[PDB]
């Protein structure tokens, strides 16, 4: 900027232990968006037909939800939310926590 | 320009709590404070160190 020390070099740096490694990833299933999704017993192969998850891959699944729904669906995800689990159980569906 | 730094730390868990000053010329004697300790979550006697 002209000769003064630049803004960043005045600021300190941020440290992260996980160097040389990849961040943890999943495929997340939002609740308010699957309302228009019309299919029970969700799984990997079912969502590929909607082009949300890549077929030539392998990645755990993640569940999130804070809304009320009535259609009973059977979820197959590797991570669950307890409040979302209760809410979806109030919908007469089923959820199994995958390893 | 002068160095009066001394580190008061806990004794039940050996913390490093507070940096303070105390003139070594008047007395080179240890001072035992009583202040709060996190890992003990209570007021304990802290002792001085370099």
């Amino acid at each position: 900027e002209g000769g003064q020390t630049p803004l960043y070099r005045r600021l300190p740096k941020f440290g992260n232990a996980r160097k040389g490694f990849l961040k943890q990833e999943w495929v997340v299933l939002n609740l308010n968006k699957i309302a228009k999704l019309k299919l029970d017993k969700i799984n990997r192969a079912s969502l590929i037909e909607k082009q949300v998850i890549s077929a030539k891959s392998q990645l755990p699944i993640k569940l999130i939800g804070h809304t009320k729904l009535e259609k009973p669906l059977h979820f197959e995800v590797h991570k669950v939310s307890k409040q979302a689990l209760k809410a979806v159980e109030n919908a007469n569906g089923s959820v199994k926590l995958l390893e | 320009a002068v160095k009066r730094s001394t580190r008061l730390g806990c004794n039940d868990c050996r913390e490093i709590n507070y940096l303070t000053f105390k003139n070594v010329k008047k007395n080179p004697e240890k001072l035992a404070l009583n202040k709060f300790c996190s890992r003990c979550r209570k007021v304990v006697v802290h002792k001085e160190v370099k």
Partner: protein, 59 residues
């Protein structure tokens, strides 16, 4: 062009801007500043609106 290594190592971006950064003048000389100043600059924040303009067109 390509992003700057120093910038990405010192700028944290989240939803809708609001760059996150820490406060300096804390990590070297403890006795030179009071504990009130130390914890007041211990937290995180975002730079002013003028510098917001200066950085928004820079990244």
């Amino acid at each position: 062009m390509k992003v700057k290594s120093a910038a990405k190592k010192r700028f944290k971006l989240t939803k809708s801007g609001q760059i996150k950064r820490k406060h300096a003048y804390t990590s070297h000389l403890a006795p030179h500043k009071t504990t009130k100043q130390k914890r007041h600059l211990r937290k995180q924040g975002t730079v002013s609106a003028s510098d917001f303009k200066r950085i928004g067109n820079l990244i």
